[PDB]
Design a protein around this nucleic acid. Structure first.
Ligand code: MG
Ligand code: MG
Ligand code: MG
Ligand code: MG
Ligand code: MG
Ligand code: MG
Lengths: 143, 110, 52, 92, 95, 49, 48, 354
RNA sequence: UCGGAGUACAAAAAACCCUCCGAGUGAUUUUAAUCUAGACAAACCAGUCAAAAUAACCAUAACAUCACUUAUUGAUCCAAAAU
């Protein structure tokens, strides 16, 4: 036979993103007595410090994947008055572009009910939606 | 006499599975009356506050921090009344997964 | 104060009767239930009185 | 499939259009039944599924409606690769 | 239970066994849950499903039913369109 | 069971075969007072018949 | 005939359904508004 | 019985007495910050971090990379300060910040990101996606130089390849362009490799492209070692990762053992170990550039399998383990009638003697 | 007859004509479906949970809530309803 045709019957895929992009990876279901719910692959984390605005995309391991902060000089010479709603818009648009560059298109955002009615977080979600990142991750296959 | 109704059998509330025990999906890990063990990773919660394993694997018991639901008014009020150096700690039940999610097998060569 | 047990029949044309406790001094009851033969959200009315 | 002379030419090309995942490198369409223990029932299932494939490719009114529940991820990721696709610099 | 009858001298059976029990050919006995027709408005949906479920009988009950049942009901039966015909036999029993 | 009876010569295919010659070849036993109505063909040996 | 009568009753009662739903919802809404307006009128009369 | 704790209690630092004098936080967000700060410390009791795969915890990362650029901190700080003062000096900036209508040039933001912290961000994406784990194991590098890969679909359509992107093989059927800024004083090596997709060996990787001794920016004028090959994932197992690595080499090095022929379609010949290959020439090459993309199966994979490599195309399937069942009991007690259906082999009536 | 606390101090169980609280239901709408892995508990009868899978609705939308929530309840047969 042809030498090249030899193949293992079981294929080993060492990429950790394969199961997540195929949506058959294990989410960490449970908890419920604590908050936020840890059932996600990627989570949007918005820290609104009295000076700066810092957004993160976190995996369930606790590692940070991509972050957009106003502590960065690259944004910092481009915006004015680091605290604003406009600063939150800059953070949201920059992180949406970085998520498109990093290939992550789905995440779970779990805001506090007083942060949900805020002006900056609502239009930051608007900038994330217009940026092309769809929140509220798809359901697991055979969950 | 004066005191009546003191006869009632136990509800058998307690701990069922220990650390190191191998469980499958759906096994009740513990049952409880008030919140004594909290559910952690891969451990579900039934409406009678029982803890049941969501995935097949090994049970672990762990101490971590308590960050309650903001919709729970008494809990968030207890958070508000804590001093600045204090953090809440509670115990949790987890199931580390043993089996992988799946495997890739060659079904047909075309 | 006493309650009454009332039988509720479907308005989707299919026969389905389910029993509900309702307070005696209240009026005739009308709810929105689920019919497992129509698989739709069906308006139900109070039809008969069974148990006190 | 190319020498299957009991079907018309548009049906023959449409079976290659839709069912190319079942086509062997030598042009062989391969169909497989597993369900029943009885191979007579397996062959009857094979001919029933073959009639299902032929009828579909033979009907010009088939619009091929696709379910969205398994394709929302594909549509969103298709639009999202089309976002980075949009830059226009001539090459090669 | 009449172990020796006065007319025929045979072993009789109790019809209260037959009127509510079903015997499979593996020795297993099938029965209904108690109270499935009583107070449906008061019980939950999961409890209603649990009472609507068929259940099996264990060893001591199954031997009691076999002792109170004559040998007519332990025969092999081939009914037309029997739903329990698929459940008559036992398979993959490694004991 | 039918192919076993025919291959062992309990019943023959040269003569038309019915429940009478099946009972005569002892392939099936019918108890009418147990309210059997006859013999049903079942498809266990359809591949090797 | 029984099956066709059942199907005709099902389709006849399903052709009248959303208008019945909206009429019952509107009736309950005006009941709530009437109770709330009666309480507001009683409060406005008792405040003076 | 009481035992002694092995280390400090969490709440033993604050004083129990005189609770009114101790300052309180009144914010659930302040508790969220404090608890997420507390959860990251290595406590002496059993933790979630110990049990749920922290990937060996603290790891001594061996750095195999270019030196970081030496930029004067005081001069950098003063020029940033003066730029900020001239930015707050304007009144129209105040107007645009107040009236919720202001836009930023995201292209210039991307350029300054690529110059400033893009290396560290691409390093943490490579650490997250496990590029270092399956190529250099514990060794890691900072992707110092900017690197741009682009695929020419047609006349004007040009599909970029950034870190962690997703490119269909129809876009990647042809050879890409590679852009990076360098003067003519150094030598470069570009290597596109498929980390997952080897059929026989799970620990090995494929070469999809390799060019060596690149004079500066000009990739085409460099000597061609291994031909470009289109991406071929499996139909079942999707999302293979393809990585472009750029190495800076000082001397001009020629390979007699790593040279691949002109058509070179044999996957036995196309078998790579990047660890051993960097072990062979550690003294010359230092990795400086990296860009990797995910890639799934499409219809264009079939022609690469059949016409180019002369293959019957393998098709895989994601098969879950069978569901667990207990040991079957002879007399089940309080169990449904469907309990026999769990242990029934096939749903076909079998007659042993009838 | 059923539940809560101590007796029974730390998994479960554990009695007395032992000491104290109760329960034989109210209020509101969020009117709370079908199917099926695996379990707790138990002499039996009973009782409890329940992931996945369908349908309903944000178009990838299943815990009725509160009153210490735990108890708020009754087996066959037989009667009336009639699906
Ligand atoms: Mg007691
Ligand atoms: Mg007792
Ligand atoms: Mg017989
Ligand atoms: Mg500085
Ligand atoms: Mg037990
Ligand atoms: Mg479910």
């Amino acid at each position: 036979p042809v030498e090249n045709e030899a193949v293992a019957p079981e294929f080993t895929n060492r990429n950790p993103r394969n199961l997540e992009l195929l949506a058959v990876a294990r989410k960490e279901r449970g908890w419920g007595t604590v908050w936020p719910s840890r059932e996600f692959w990627h989570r949007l984390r918005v820290i609104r410090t009295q000076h700066h605005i810092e957004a993160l995309v976190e995996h369930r391991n606790g590692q940070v994947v991509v972050s957009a902060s106003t502590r960065e000089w690259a944004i910092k010479k481009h915006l004015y008055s680091t605290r604003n709603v406009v600063a939150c818009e800059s953070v949201g648009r920059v992180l949406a572009e970085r998520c498109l560059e990093a290939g992550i298109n789905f995440m779970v955002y779990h805001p506090t009910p007083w942060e949900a009615a805020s002006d900056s977080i609502k239009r930051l979600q608007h900038a994330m939606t217009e940026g092309g990142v769809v929140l509220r991750e798809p359901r697991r296959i055979y969950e | 006499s004066k005191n009546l109704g003191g006869k009632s059998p136990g509800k058998r509330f307690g701990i069922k599975k220990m650390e190191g025990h191998y469980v499958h999906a759906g096994n009740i890990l513990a049952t409880q009356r008030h919140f004594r063990w909290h559910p952690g990773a891969h451990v579900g919660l039934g409406k009678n506050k029982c803890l049941y394993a969501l995935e097949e694997g090994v049970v672990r018991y762990t101490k971590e921090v308590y960050v309650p639901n903001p919709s729970n008014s008494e809990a968030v009020d207890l958070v508000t009344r804590l001093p600045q150096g204090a953090v809440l700690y509670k115990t949790f039940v987890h199931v580390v997964p043993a089996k992988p999610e799946g495997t890739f097998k060659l079904v047909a060569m075309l | 104060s006493k309650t009454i047990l009332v039988k509720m029949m479907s308005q989707a044309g299919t026969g389905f009767s389910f029993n509900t406790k309702r307070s005696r001094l209240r009026e005739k009851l009308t709810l929105l239930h689920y019919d497992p033969v129509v698989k739709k959200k069906v308006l139900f009315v109070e039809q008969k009185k069974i148990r006190s | 499939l190319a020498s299957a002379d009991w079907i018309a030419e548009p049906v023959r090309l449409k079976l290659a259009v839709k069912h190319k995942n079942r086509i062997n490198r030598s042009g062989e369409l391969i169909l497989t039944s597993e369900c029943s223990r009885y191979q007579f029932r397996n062959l009857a299932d094979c001919l029933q599924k073959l009639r299902d494939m032929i009828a579909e490719a033979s009907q010009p009114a088939k619009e091929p409606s696709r379910e969205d529940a398994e394709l929302r991820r594909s549509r969103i990721e298709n639009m999202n690769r089309e976002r980075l696709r949009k830059k226009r610099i001539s090459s090669a | 239970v009449t172990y020796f009858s006065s007319r025929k001298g045979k072993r009789k059976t109790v019809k209260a066994v037959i009127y509510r029990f079903l015997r499979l050919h593996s020795g297993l006995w099938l029965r209904r849950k108690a109270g499935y027709k009583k107070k449906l408005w008061k019980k939950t949906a999961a409890r209603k499903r649990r009472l609507r479920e068929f259940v099996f009988c264990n060893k001591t009950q199954s031997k009691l039913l076999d002792k109170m049942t004559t040998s007519f009901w332990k025969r092999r039966n081939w009914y037309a369109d029997d739903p329990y015909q698929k459940y008559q036999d036992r398979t993959n029993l490694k004991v | 069971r039918l192919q076993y009876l025919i291959d062992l010569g309990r019943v023959d295919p040269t003569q038309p075969i019915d429940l009478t010659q099946l009972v005569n070849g002892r392939g099936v036993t019918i108890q009418p007072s147990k309210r059997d109505y006859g013999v049903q063909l079942v498809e266990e040996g359809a591949d090797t018949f | 005939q029984k099956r066709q009568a059942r199907e005709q009753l099902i389709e006849e009662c399903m052709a009248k359904m959303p208008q019945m739903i909206e009429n019952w919802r509107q009736q309950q809404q005006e009941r709530r508004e009437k109770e709330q307006a009666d309480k507001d009128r009683r409060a406005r009369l008792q405040a003076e | 019985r009481r035992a002694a704790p092995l280390g400090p209690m969490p709440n033993e630092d604050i004083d129990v007495s005189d609770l009114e004098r101790l300052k309180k936080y009144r914010s659930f967000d302040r508790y969220r910050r404090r608890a997420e700060q507390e959860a990251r410390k290595p406590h002496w009791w059993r933790t979630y971090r110990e049990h749920f795969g922290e990937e060996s915890g603290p790891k001594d990362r061996v750095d195999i990379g270019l030196p970081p650029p030496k930029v004067s901190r005081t001069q950098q700080l003063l020029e940033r300060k003066q730029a900020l003062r001239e930015l707050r000096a304007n009144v129209e900036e105040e107007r645009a910040a107040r009236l919720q209508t202001a836009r930023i040039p995201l292209e210039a933001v991307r350029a300054e990101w690529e110059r400033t912290c893009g290396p560290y961000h691409k390093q943490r994406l490579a650490e997250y996606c496990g590029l270092y784990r399956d190529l250099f194991h514990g060794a890691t590098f900072v992707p110092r130089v900017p690197l741009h890969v682009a695929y020419a679909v047609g006349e004007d359509d040009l599909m970029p390849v950034y870190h962690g992107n997703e490119v269909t093989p129809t876009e990647a059927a042809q050879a890409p362009e590679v852009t990076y800024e360098a003067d003519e004083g150094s030598l470069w090596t570009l290597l596109l490799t498929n980390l997952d997709g080897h059929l026989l060996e799970p620990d090995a990787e494929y070469v999809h492209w390799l060019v060596t001794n690149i004079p500066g920016n000009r990739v085409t004028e460099g000597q061609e070692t291994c031909p470009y090959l289109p991406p071929f994932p499996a139909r079942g197992s999707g999302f293979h990762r393809f990585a472009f690595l750029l190495f800076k080499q000082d001397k001009r090095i020629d390979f007699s053992g790593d040279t691949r022929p002109s058509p070179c379609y044999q996957l036995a010949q196309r078998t790579f170990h990047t660890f051993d290959f960097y072990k062979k020439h550690q003294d010359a090459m230092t990795p400086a550039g990296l860009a990797f993309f995910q890639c799934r199966w499409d219809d264009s994979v079939t022609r690469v399998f059949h016409q180019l490599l002369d293959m019957r195309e393998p098709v895989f399937e994601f098969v879950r383990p069978p569901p667990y069942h207990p040991k079957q009991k002879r007399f089940p007690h309080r169990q449904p009638l469907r309990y026999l259906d769990r242990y029934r082999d096939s749903h076909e009536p079998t007659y042993g003697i009838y």
